[PDB]
Design a protein around this ligand. Structure first.
Ligand SMILES: CNc1cc2onc(C)c2cc1NS(=O)(=O)c1cc(Br)ccc1OC
Ligand code: NA
Length: 126
């Protein structure tokens, strides 16, 4: 097992901008998920070598983590909040795909996902 390159956090070929919604996603949504007790497995790309997970990138082809999401928001990688929201969902979904119902990591992802959904219920309109 080697690790694949991490997801891009910059791209000259990809339209990007700042929005009010994206700023909230960084300052309020991301920051509250990042500081939760259960953030730690999701703060960086999965290191399948150091975690001894040789099948991780056999199963998961569109990997995502909050480290990547944070650097994207900070770099203004996104065109809109929906793209950023989709990266969160990919993150959660990957966890639920690779693992099983009730697994410790799954229960952590579910808890972060609940909090995420709450927080983005307060997302401004443009
Ligand atoms: C079962 N190991 C893991 C599965 C994972 O799915 N998505 C991620 C991210 C992820 C990370 C691990 N490895 S781990 O962080 O050391 C880990 C976390 C938790 Br909660 C419980 C068990 C773990 O490793 C046995
Ligand atoms: Na699964």
């Amino acid at each position: 097992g080697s690790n694949p390159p991490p997801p891009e956090t910059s791209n000259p070929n990809k339209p990007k901008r700042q929005t009010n919604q994206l700023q909230y996603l960084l300052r309020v949504v991301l920051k509250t998920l990042w500081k939760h007790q259960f953030a730690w497995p999701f703060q960086q790309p999965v290191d399948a070598v150091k975690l001894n997970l040789p099948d991780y990138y056999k199963i998961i082809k569109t990997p995502m983590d909050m480290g990547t999401i944070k650097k994207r928001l900070e770099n203004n990688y996104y065109w809109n909040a929906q793209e950023c929201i989709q990266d969160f969902n990919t993150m959660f979904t990957n966890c639920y795909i690779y693992n099983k119902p009730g697994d410790d990591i799954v229960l952590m992802a579910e808890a972060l996902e609940k909090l995420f959904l709450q927080k983005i219920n307060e997302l401004p309109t443009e």
